[PDB]
Amino acid sequence: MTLKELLVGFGTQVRSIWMIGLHAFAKRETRMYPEEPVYLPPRYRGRIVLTRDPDGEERCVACNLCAVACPVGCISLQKAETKDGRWYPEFFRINFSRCIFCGLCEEACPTTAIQLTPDFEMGEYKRQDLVYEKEDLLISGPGKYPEYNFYRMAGMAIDGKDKGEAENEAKPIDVKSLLP
Amino acid sequence: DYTLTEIVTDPLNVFMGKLNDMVNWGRKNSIWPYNFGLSCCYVEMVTSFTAVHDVARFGAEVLRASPRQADLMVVAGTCFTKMAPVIQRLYDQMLEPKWVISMGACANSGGMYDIYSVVQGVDKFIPVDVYIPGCPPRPEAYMQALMLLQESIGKERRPLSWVVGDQGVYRANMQSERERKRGERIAVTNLRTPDEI
Amino acid sequence: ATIHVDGKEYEVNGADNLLEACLSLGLDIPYFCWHPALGSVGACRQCAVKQYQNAEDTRGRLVMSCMTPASDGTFISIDDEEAKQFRESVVEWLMTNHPHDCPVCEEGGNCHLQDMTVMTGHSFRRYRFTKRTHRNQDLGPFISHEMNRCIACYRCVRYYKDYAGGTDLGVYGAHDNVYFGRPEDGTLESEFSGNLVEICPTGVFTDKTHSERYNRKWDMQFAPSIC
Amino acid sequence: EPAWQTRDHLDDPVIGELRNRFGPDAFTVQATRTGVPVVWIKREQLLEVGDFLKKLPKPYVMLFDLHGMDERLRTHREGLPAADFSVFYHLISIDRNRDIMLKVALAENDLHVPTFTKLFPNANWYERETWDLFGITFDGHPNLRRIMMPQTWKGHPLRKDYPARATEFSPFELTKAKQDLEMEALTFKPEEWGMKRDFMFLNLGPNHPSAHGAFRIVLQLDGEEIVDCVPDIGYHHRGAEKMGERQSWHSYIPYTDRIEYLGGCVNEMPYVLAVEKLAGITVPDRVNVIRVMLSELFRINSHLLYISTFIQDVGAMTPVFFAFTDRQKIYDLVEAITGFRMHPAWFRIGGVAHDLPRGWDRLLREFLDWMPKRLASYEKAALQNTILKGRSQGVAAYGAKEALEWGTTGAGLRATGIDFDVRKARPYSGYENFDFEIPVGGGVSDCYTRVMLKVEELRQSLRILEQCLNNMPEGPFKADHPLTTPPPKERTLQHIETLITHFLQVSWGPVMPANESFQMIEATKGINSYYLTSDGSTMSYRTRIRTPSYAHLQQIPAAIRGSLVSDLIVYLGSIDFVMSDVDR
Ligand SMILES: CCCCCCCCCCC1=C(C)C(=O)C(OC)=C(OC)C1=O
Numbered sequence A: 001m002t003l004k005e006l007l008v009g010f011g012t013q014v015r016s017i018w019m020i021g022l023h024a025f026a027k028r029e030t031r032m033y034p035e036e037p038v039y040l041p042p043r044y045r046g047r048i049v050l051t052r053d054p055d056g057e058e059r060c061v062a063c064n065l066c067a068v069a070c071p072v073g074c075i076s077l078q079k080a081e082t083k084d085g086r087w088y089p090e091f092f093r094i095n096f097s098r099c100i101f102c103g104l105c106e107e108a109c110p111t112t113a114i115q116l117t118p119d120f121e122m123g124e125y126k127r128q129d130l131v132y133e134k135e136d137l138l139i140s141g142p143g144k145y146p147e148y149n150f151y152r153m154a155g156m157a158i159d160g161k162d163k164g165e166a167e168n169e170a171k172p173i174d175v176k177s178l179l180p
Numbered sequence B: 001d002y003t004l005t006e007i008v009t010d011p012l013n014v015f016m017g018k019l020n021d022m023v024n025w026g027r028k029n030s031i032w033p034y035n036f037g038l039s040c041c042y043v044e045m046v047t048s049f050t051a052v053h054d055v056a057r058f059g060a061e062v063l064r065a066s067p068r069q070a071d072l073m074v075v076a077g078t079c080f081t082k083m084a085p086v087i088q089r090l091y092d093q094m095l096e097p098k099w100v101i102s103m104g105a106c107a108n109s110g111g112m113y114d115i116y117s118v119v120q121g122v123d124k125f126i127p128v129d130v131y132i133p134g135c136p137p138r139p140e141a142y143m144q145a146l147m148l149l150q151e152s153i154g155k156e157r158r159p160l161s162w163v164v165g166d167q168g169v170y171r172a173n174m175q176s177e178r179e180r181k182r183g184e185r186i187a188v189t190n191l192r193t194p195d196e197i
Numbered sequence C: 001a002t003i004h005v006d007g008k009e010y011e012v013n014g015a016d017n018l019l020e021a022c023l024s025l026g027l028d029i030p031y032f033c034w035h036p037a038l039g040s041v042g043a044c045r046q047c048a049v050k051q052y053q054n055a056e057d058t059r060g061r062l063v064m065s066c067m068t069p070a071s072d073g074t075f076i077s078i079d080d081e082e083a084k085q086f087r088e089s090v091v092e093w094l095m096t097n098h099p100h101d102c103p104v105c106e107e108g109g110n111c112h113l114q115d116m117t118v119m120t121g122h123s124f125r126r127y128r129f130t131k132r133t134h135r136n137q138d139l140g141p142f143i144s145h146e147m148n149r150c151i152a153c154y155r156c157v158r159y160y161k162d163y164a165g166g167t168d169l170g171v172y173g174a175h176d177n178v179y180f181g182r183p184e185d186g187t188l189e190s191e192f193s194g195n196l197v198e199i200c201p202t203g204v205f206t207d208k209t210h211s212e213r214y215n216r217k218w219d220m221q222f223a224p225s226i227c
Numbered sequence D: 001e002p003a004w005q006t007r008d009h010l011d012d013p014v015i016g017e018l019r020n021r022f023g024p025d026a027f028t029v030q031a032t033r034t035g036v037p038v039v040w041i042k043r044e045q046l047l048e049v050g051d052f053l054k055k056l057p058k059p060y061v062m063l064f065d066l067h068g069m070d071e072r073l074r075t076h077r078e079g080l081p082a083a084d085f086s087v088f089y090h091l092i093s094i095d096r097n098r099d100i101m102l103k104v105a106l107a108e109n110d111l112h113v114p115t116f117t118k119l120f121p122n123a124n125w126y127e128r129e130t131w132d133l134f135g136i137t138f139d140g141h142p143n144l145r146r147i148m149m150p151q152t153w154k155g156h157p158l159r160k161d162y163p164a165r166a167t168e169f170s171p172f173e174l175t176k177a178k179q180d181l182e183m184e185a186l187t188f189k190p191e192e193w194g195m196k197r198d199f200m201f202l203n204l205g206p207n208h209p210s211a212h213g214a215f216r217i218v219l220q221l222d223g224e225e226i227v228d229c230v231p232d233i234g235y236h237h238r239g240a241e242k243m244g245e246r247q248s249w250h251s252y253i254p255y256t257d258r259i260e261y262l263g264g265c266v267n268e269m270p271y272v273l274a275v276e277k278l279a280g281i282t283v284p285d286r287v288n289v290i291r292v293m294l295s296e297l298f299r300i301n302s303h304l305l306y307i308s309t310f311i312q313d314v315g316a317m318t319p320v321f322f323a324f325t326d327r328q329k330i331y332d333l334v335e336a337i338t339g340f341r342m343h344p345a346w347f348r349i350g351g352v353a354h355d356l357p358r359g360w361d362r363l364l365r366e367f368l369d370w371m372p373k374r375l376a377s378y379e380k381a382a383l384q385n386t387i388l389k390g391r392s393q394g395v396a397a398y399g400a401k402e403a404l405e406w407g408t409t410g411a412g413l414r415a416t417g418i419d420f421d422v423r424k425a426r427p428y429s430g431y432e433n434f435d436f437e438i439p440v441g442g443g444v445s446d447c448y449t450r451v452m453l454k455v456e457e458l459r460q461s462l463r464i465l466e467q468c469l470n471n472m473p474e475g476p477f478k479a480d481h482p483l484t485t486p487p488p489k490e491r492t493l494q495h496i497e498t499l500i501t502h503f504l505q506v507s508w509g510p511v512m513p514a515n516e517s518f519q520m521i522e523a524t525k526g527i528n529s530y531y532l533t534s535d536g537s538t539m540s541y542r543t544r545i546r547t548p549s550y551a552h553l554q555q556i557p558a559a560i561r562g563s564l565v566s567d568l569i570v571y572l573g574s575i576d577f578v579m580s581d582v583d584r
């Protein structure tokens, strides 16, 4: 081979050594997990929770929209009703061994009950323990949507909210009333 | 509360206990994963291997192309029907002690691919030590799984020699992380609104 | 008989009306107040098509297809822009007083009103005023009553009275306070009161026995069986 | 007339040429929303029609796609020839900047077509896959064997009567397949593999210690020289098209994410554009700008991965660490916007899932300041190294003729000097409003030439990001169409019409009216296309995904023959493929 290209190659190797050495003189780019906590943006799609309304009741009306919108089919729930007439989940289970954390259930929730939260540490020793029941999903507050209350908009009468007491609702006029 | 390979109690002289603790310390502080790329979960694994995450700090960066030298098999990807005998053969080629981490929903259960050409989870044919949910799990989830595996390794009993003592492997029955973190997870009230950064 | 729908020739039966003739051909006309067993009364005004006097006609006229006979040589258009806008307006007028109830309503996923709201392409609300409400009655152990969801399509009264021969269900009130139910709380006396849950296109009459252990229609496993 | 309007394309000169050559009754023109002339050709005239298109004055030189379709359950086939099955051939004329689909009808019993391998050599794998997934025989094919499923597979998975879900796992089948893998090297016959004839035989895979997947290559060797090589693919077959027949239009977006997993929103883009063609949705300009932003960010991510993987395959180990730090910066921005890292599933039918979060421009500005010095450092540290140039230059070269005849698109085709980028030739998603150049090669596609073209593409994507940051429109992030899935969330949460539309769209699915649409985009690795058939239902009747890695892997034996095995490793590292893209 040519001597000129040999000298060019030697100079290029020396230059590469020089850049790697100067990059050794640089600053570390490592975020030291777990001593340094990982920053997650507020809409990060991690662990799924069920949230509560500002009045403290659970937001889920067991409408099963998240379960059907799930492409993996890893949400199972059953509707139950209290004595006042509000709907709630009798049970709610998410199989997190199947869940792909796609956020379609949060997108499909009309009450903002189901939410994907910035939490990624969900490793488990047993796969059966990745099936999260309702006691593992229901949190103490409203999560990412602080003020929305579906039952303040719905037309059904529940405790503390009779007919005509929802948003943009008039009082019910009886057909027996004297006014035309 | 252990598992012998049957639910038995803790078998652990006091010098043998110290030797077992030293062996477990050396095993958990030096874990050599096998370089096996199935799907996108492997991309997040090797992302954890790089400079911005530095999985080398836990002593787990020596990524082996030979299953003989590897201690940890990270099934990180879909367990396809054509790839499942390859996975089983590579697991069989490993040496005791060997540990398995399912990374991602595909390796956990099949994930979104409940389809004709996918085996629904790698626990169908190999025993798994640590499962990671996610599609993909982020690199620090793989690091957290490594610490979970280290904590599981540090409380297991294995024979010091193949000629002296009980040769059974006693794996501890750990408390589930769901039950452990249920105290701090339910107490969460308010999160940051998604419209911010 | 011969009809021309959107410029396409069709051979139908002349004794039928236009809505049932077009539904028998696979054409999609939204409708509420018509039923194949109850006949046509032309209340809901949802089935509007544009009829022309002949082939060389451009103006036309909106007619109710449920009340228009499918006579020979009848020229109509379903996909006419004026007819589409009127059907969307009818769905919108029905939607002005409708409760925000679909997640907590037993007719969700099985709702004719949902299907026709989507079918008309109406998804933007420009009504900002209040919506009327109604008290509910107790109809017995079988039928649950939710009067807010009513669209005043009169199917229940026509079925229960003119078809089933029942006496205790009726329509009361006036202009936009029309009420459909019994004069007082009590069990529906007819032995065929349960068909109201399929006759009603909304969630007013619902299966209470199903509403105990409720699940949506897509979640059911069905089989063809004999009672 | 919008871009999604149903056209018959009878004004295309190819229709007039076909009428003047074969007569007016020799074929049937189908009106679609695919944007191409769709022509049903009789089976006995298929070879002469293909030859006539190959011998045009501005000929159709590339077979873009070739696949089957099971039409037995299709109810809305008005104006279509009677067909239990059909085979479509998508051909591209680069000089005309046009493309044509030819469809051959097939009866249920007579499932055989003449082979297309004589006219187009890249038809081999497409016909193998069509036989594998549909049972359609191709007469005259050299080795018509299964390519996705194993050879001991019963049935054809893409047929309508084939059960989509996973069968019950059995240890017996796993043990039998392990024994088959063990005795495969003992009872290897180089006749069923399409090979012929001191000739060593070696297996590279199936497991591979690299980031592009794990696949097996059977190598025939004369010493170090490669005499013949066939790839064993299908090891990463996820059944994505069959899942297209099983999900709704909205819930299939996460599956489109995982076609090639370095692309993300780049993979979401052709699917949502094709669904918007089916829905008649013209998205607003801010939607186009946001989707272009995310596509270019993920293009930079994928190109950084590709350059790092190539450099590590050559032998330098540090730039992969640095470019993974750069990928972390990109992932920070993408996590802020979409909420996820590599499978965002953020594109919606009619727009995107959310608006841009307040503060995204700071992260974009930080990345735009971070990137160019790092890219220059990568160039001066590894890409200008003479050892890397010696390992890369002159390795697996081909001209424009080989790139055209094998369907090679992306950086290889442009490294052969052919200036054919989808973002310029057939613009989509408002790419005409951005000023960016298309780098081209001198006429020879080396490994080094492909890598430097990808570097220049990275720089052009940085330029696109700069123009998008300086000029960001204000407006809606979703279209105002009734078929925008899902509707905007606040209107869903306080309006009953929007709640009804949301309820029916997320549960039963949006109803796409019966039509056929097609979208082709310039992905990170080549041309990625979605061909969508709707039978009027809430699910896709057919979801055909054309990926470029399939074509590049089929081009592999025609370019590496006569070379060494280290050259094969370098060629694998410089192709920019992932095995999920190959098998899908
Ligand atoms: C028998 C030959 C042994 C060669 C040395 C093997 C052990 C060192 C591996 C170094 C390494 C390589 C190459 C490497 O590519 C890599 O990235 C995935 C690492 O993790 C950060 C590594 O640690």
Ligand code: SF4
Pocket: A066, A069, A070, A071, A072, A073, A074, A075, A094, A098, A099, A100, A101, A102, A103, A104, A105, A106
């Ligand atoms: S994030 Fe996606 S996969 Fe997970 S439960 Fe929700 S819809 Fe299902």
Ligand code: SF4
Pocket: A059, A060, A061, A062, A063, A064, A065, A066, A067, A077, A105, A108, A109, A110, A111, A112, A113, A114, C103
């Ligand atoms: S979509 Fe929301 S309200 Fe409906 S069942 Fe799911 S979590 Fe509950």
Ligand code: SF4
Pocket: A100, B039, B040, B041, B042, B076, B077, B078, B103, B104, B105, B106, B107, B111, B134, B135, B136, B137, D258, D261
């Ligand atoms: S779990 Fe998701 S990210 Fe991981 S291999 Fe499967 S599709 Fe890829």
Ligand code: SF4
Pocket: C098, C099, C100, C101, C102, C105, C106, C107, C108, C109, C111, C112, C113, C114, C149, C201, C202, C203, C204, D500
């Ligand atoms: S009757 Fe229909 S439109 Fe009305 S709340 Fe129930 S599901 Fe919704």
Ligand code: SF4
Pocket: C149, C150, C151, C152, C153, C154, C155, C156, C157, C180, C199, C200, C201, C202, C204, C205
């Ligand atoms: S209660 Fe039902 S059937 Fe009766 S008028 Fe109202 S919507 Fe029609």
Ligand code: FES
Pocket: C019, C030, C031, C032, C033, C034, C041, C042, C043, C044, C045, C046, C047, C048, C064, C065, C066, C067
């Ligand atoms: S269906 Fe004709 S007006 Fe009601």
